[PDB]
Curated annotation (Swiss-Prot), chain A:
ATP binds at residues 149-156. The 26S proteasome is involved in the ATP-dependent degradation of ubiquitinated proteins. The regulatory (or ATPase) complex confers ATP dependency and substrate specificity to the 26S complex. Has ATPase activity. This is 26S proteasome regulatory subunit 4 homolog. One of its GO terms (biological process) is protein-containing complex localization. It comes from Saccharomyces cerevisiae (strain ATCC 204508 / S288c) (Baker's yeast). The chain holds residues 75 to 436 of 437 of the full protein. There is a cross-link at residues 160, 181, 216 (Glycyl lysine isopeptide (Lys-Gly) (interchain with G-Cter in ubiquitin)). Keywords: ATP-binding, Cytoplasm, Isopeptide bond, Lipoprotein, Myristate, Nucleotide-binding, Nucleus, Proteasome, Ubl conjugation.
Curated annotation (Swiss-Prot), chain B:
The 26S proteasome is involved in the ATP-dependent degradation of ubiquitinated proteins. The regulatory (or ATPase) complex confers ATP dependency and substrate specificity to the 26S complex. It is found in: Cytoplasm; Nucleus. It comes from the Eukaryota. May form a homodimer or a heterodimer with a related family member. Interacts with OLA1, TMA17, and UBR1. Belongs to the AAA ATPase family. Present with 4700 molecules/cell in log phase SD medium. This is 26S proteasome regulatory subunit 8 homolog. N-acetylated by NAT1.
Amino acid sequence: FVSNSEILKPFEKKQEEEKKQLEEIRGNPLSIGTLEEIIDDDHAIVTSPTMPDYYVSILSFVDKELLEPGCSVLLHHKTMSIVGVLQDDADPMVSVMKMDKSPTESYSDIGGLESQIQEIKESVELPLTHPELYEEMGIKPPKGVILYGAPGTGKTLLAKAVANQTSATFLRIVGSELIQKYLGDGPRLCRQIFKVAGENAPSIVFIDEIDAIGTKRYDSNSGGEREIQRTMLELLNQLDGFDDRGDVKVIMATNKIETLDPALIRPGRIDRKILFENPDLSTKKKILGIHTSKMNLSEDVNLETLVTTKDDLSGADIQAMCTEAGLLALRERRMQVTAEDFKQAKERVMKNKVEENLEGLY
Amino acid sequence: NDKVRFIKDELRLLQEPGSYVGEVIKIVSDKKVLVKVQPEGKYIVDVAKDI
């Protein structure tokens, strides 16, 4: 009664009076611009997309700590005054492309790497989710891990399941998008990726399939020989040009890290080397059982037979035989897939592309 | 009488300066909308009371 009349009543009345004063500031004569520089005199020069020049003062609700060069502030049409700081107009429009919040992945499909899975967890999942581990002991957690191995081992799926446990934004980078040839432009795009990761501080940085130009391998976007120097050394200048104790963790992954520049490896940031291998026959039943959980199997079909037949195959090859055997019975409109479809699937998918060494016995 | 009144009512509409063209970008709770004009730049304007 007494407190509610002296608090709630003047609060709702003051908020309505502040909006009335915005008619001379945020009212219809309103425009925007691009901030250039700020001076200690409470004045700045801002250029709108129509390329004018406006030198005015700074209004309320905003300080100079939030005003940075290159951003977009808010202007006025008549008085031309700077209102306040705002985010990127229309936004960069980067929401989910290489980045997301909580991807859906488990440890069953990546099974078989458990020997090397405990290495990435303790160096990434443990320090990020449990920061008290390295703080109480005073040790420095690994600031990055390198990924090397044959494809099909779930290289992307390895860090995908870790991102769901950390409950943080998981960044990715395509190797071919940084080397795009417009004019130069190679190092310019690299800075914009790490700049966004510094504002919100997701504390997760990952790169999938590092390629650049080893030799050629491109047509539309080439870059020449000068692109190799300005690209591969730009990723080095991120860790070498800045010292970040506990936040940015850079993780690099590709098919072959040997041909890469030893300077690009940046020793001392990545203290862990993880090797990828194909899963053994013991872990194939976990992946096969998931895809066949919704599949109708006949009485003569045994799961232990398909696992024994598989020799030197990736994780995608387990679901490939289930897809091929499922389409054979789908064309004939059968409920339970016959054992003949499973036999023809495991034999065909085994040898398709390269049947023979083409020369000698090797 | 209806033809002359119609032509007279349409006369003040042509004498009106008219309006620009733009596209809505984003909206807020302040009733201020960002409209991107093709020839001009982006302008944050207040919505009408009818909408």
